[PDB]
Design a protein around this ligand. Structure first.
Ligand SMILES: [Ca+2]
Ligand SMILES: [Ca+2]
Length: 108
């Protein structure tokens, strides 16, 4: 749980909602978890947390573990949920998400 970035109560509620396999929706999640309200600074901080290996991009393997960044015992996304999420953010087609594609994804 992003203790110094997001309210723990909104995370619980966002995780509760996409518990069933294939029920994940990123725009629903971002809205519920409270990330959409955030400024460019906080959105960049979120990016860094998700970019587990600090390569500058969120690769497919990290995107599949997306929920675990909020709650350690959260489920992994299905390959179907991962491909959809990937395809929505990856504006340039290199197979990964950079900080600008993330910012747009979170905000638009
Ligand atoms: Ca990475
Ligand atoms: Ca990309």
């Amino acid at each position: 749980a992003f203790a110094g970035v997001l309210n723990d109560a909104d995370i619980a509620a966002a995780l509760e909602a996409c518990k069933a396999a294939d029920s994940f929706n990123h725009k629903a999640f971002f809205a519920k978890v409270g990330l959409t309200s955030k400024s460019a600074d906080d959105v960049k901080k979120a990016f860094a947390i998700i970019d587990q290996d600090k390569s500058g991009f969120i690769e497919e393997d990290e995107l599949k573990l997306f929920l675990q960044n909020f709650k350690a015992d959260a489920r992994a996304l299905t390959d179907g949920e991962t491909k959809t999420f990937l395809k929505a953010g990856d504006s340039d087609g290199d197979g990964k998400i950079g900080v600008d594609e993330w910012t747009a994804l979170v905000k638009a």
